[PDB]
Ligand binder design. Structure first.
Ligand SMILES: *[C@@H]1O[C@H](CO)[C@@H](O)[C@H](O)[C@H]1NC(C)=O
Lengths: 33, 50
């Protein structure tokens, strides 16, 4: 059996607090869907 | 005999700090601060961030 990863597999890339900002990172994440 | 000391520079709560003694903290004044080795100058105020 298989399923569709429904918006999963994203983790906090580091330990820095950020707010009200969009931050771009490249690392090993599970792709959406 | 060789020992290599690998340092993770700061990104998380620090636990291994040098013999430099801490000082008291003064708020709402322009100060030259050093927090866990990260240095800079500015005024420290209370905040409501989490
Ligand atoms: C898993 O992926 C394949 C190819 O993308 C697809 O044909 C299959 O139906 C998927 N599994 C399910 C349960 O949909």
């Amino acid at each position: 059996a298989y399923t569709n990863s429904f918006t999963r597999g994203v983790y906090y890339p580091d330990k820095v607090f950020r707010s009200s900002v969009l931050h771009s990172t490249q690392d090993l994440f599970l792709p959406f869907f | 005999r060789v020992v290599v000391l690998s340092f993770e520079l700061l990104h998380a709560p620090a636990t291994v700090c040098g013999p430099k003694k801490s000082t008291n903290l003064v708020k709402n004044k322009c100060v030259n601060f050093n927090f866990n080795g990260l240095t800079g100058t500015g005024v420290l105020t209370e905040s409501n961030k989490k």
